[PDB]
Design a protein that fits this description.
- The complex is a heterotetramer, with two copies of chain A (236 residues) and two copies of chain B (10 residues).
- Chain A is mostly helical.
- Helices cover 77% and strands 0% of the residues of chain A.
- In chain A, helix 5 runs parallel beside helix 7, helix 6 runs antiparallel to helix 7 and helix 8 packs antiparallel against helix 9.
- The N and C termini of chain A lie far apart (48 Å).
- Chain B has no helix or strand.
- In chain B, 20% of the residues are buried.
- Classes of the chains: A mainly alpha (236), B little secondary structure (10).
- Chains in contact: A-B, A-C, C-D.
- The structure holds magnesium ion (8 copies).
- The PDB classes it as peptide binding protein.
Chain lengths: 236, 10, 236, 10
């Protein structure tokens, strides 16, 4: 890999500089290089990896949705035929998006998940696995669509089972997991009632545990609780 | 339009 | 070039899709491919080329300024030594920026400027030449800094001489040229009085020609006049 | 902080 000659600590330092500069493709390449050194990641380093790739795939998803909308309109009744270019360019952005998701899934499988023994690291990585299968499912249309959806579901379910046994209901990893699994049910699995039930239960169990928290922990947990409430407002 | 989260406060 | 197998019209179509998707690196690669077909560019196609590269180099310039600020702070008195990483990463972004400017300058020299005979196309390209030498001058520090500054000045001066002979004082190409040359004088050439004089004269001569314009032309010209006034407010 | 312009209305 092109980062193989750079020290681990220098890759982490440069990932933080790239974040300040809003250079998220660079940030992701630096963090990929750090993972490939083979050592486990600290909490802060896990968050740098996820922020970098979220920003890269987020720009690809936004572009894909614009292009897919134009393509679908061109397939309506009365729309002028304009040739293969819209489909070709949507396909180009799709293939790039798939490549990024495959890169993240490959880092998780070789070897981040198998070396993660503490609940906080294991749940974080299994959540990420569910998220990147979810982004693959948003663009999937062929023979493997069902299997891609089931891979997202299976990763999120294993993460949920560990989080319920090992973490309090206010823990920010547990809350963000439940938030994103609820989005999976609503947007991917055609299961809006499951989405609303999960978001409601998660919100109520977190509310009842806030009394145990410091001011700083309370701020972290209530920020995510607000996102659950905002989705419930959109979905009901 | 739905909200999701990639990070987890340390 | 990787775009050599694609039709000219399909490259233009995809550049417009890329703009809608906010995929400006793609947009610039499509427009580079269109220029390399060897035909002159229409007015709309010139604007697609300039918007694409402005967005690419604009992100690089913003990142370079963040990194340069961090590097300069680390060279103050009392600042902790942190190794070569800040300098290395500033250099990386700098070299990428220089490469983009060299690509645009190369398109202008081979062969857009020499085939542009009408005043509107010739002035547009000479302005672009001045702009991309200006972006090189913002990061220049060595033996060629003076020559880079003089190349920007010479391109802007030739564009000004043609624009004054061939275009009205409200023409949007002429106004944007004068705006950007005034920025060159203030920020690059250490000539704030020349900058303020040019902006003032340009504004006043445009104001006196607005009576000749349709409502739509008036909107186009007054938008640029407002930028001249905003700079004069910042500089005085 | 200064304003500049890349395009020219047709
Ligand atoms: Mg080492
Ligand atoms: Mg394409
Ligand atoms: Mg371990
Ligand atoms: Mg997320
Ligand atoms: Mg042809
Ligand atoms: Mg570097
Ligand atoms: Mg000609
Ligand atoms: Mg400009």
């Amino acid at each position: 890999g092109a980062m193989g000659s750079m020290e681990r600590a220098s890759l982490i330092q440069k990932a933080k500089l790239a974040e300040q500069a809003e250079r998220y493709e660079d940030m992701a390449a630096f963090m990929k290089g750090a993972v490939e050194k083979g050592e486990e990641l600290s909490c802060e380093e896990r968050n740098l990896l996820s922020v970098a790739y979220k920003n890269v795939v987020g720009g690809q998803r936004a572009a894909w949705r614009v292009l897919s909308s134009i393509e679908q309109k061109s397939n309506e009744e009365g729309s002028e035929e304009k040739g293969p270019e819209v489909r070709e360019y949507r396909e180009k952005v799709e293939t790039e998006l798939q490549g990024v998701c495959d890169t993240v899934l490959g880092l998780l499988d070789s070897h981040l998940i198998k070396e993660a023994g503490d609940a906080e690291s294991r749940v974080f990585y299994l959540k990420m696995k569910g998220d990147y299968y979810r982004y693959l499912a948003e663009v999937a249309t062929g023979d493997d669509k069902k299997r891609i959806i089931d891979s997202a579901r299976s990763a999120y379910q294993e993460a949920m089972d560990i989080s319920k046994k090992e973490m309090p209901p206010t823990n920010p990893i547990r809350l963000g997991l439940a938030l994103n699994f609820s989005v999976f049910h609503y947007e991917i699995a055609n299961s809006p009632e499951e989405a609303i039930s999960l978001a409601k239960t998660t919100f109520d169990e977190a509310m009842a545990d806030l009394h145990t928290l410091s001011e700083d922990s309370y701020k972290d947990s209530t920020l995510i609780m607000q996102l659950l409430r905002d989705n419930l407002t959109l979905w009901t | 339009a739905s909200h999701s989260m990639p990070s987890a406060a340390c």
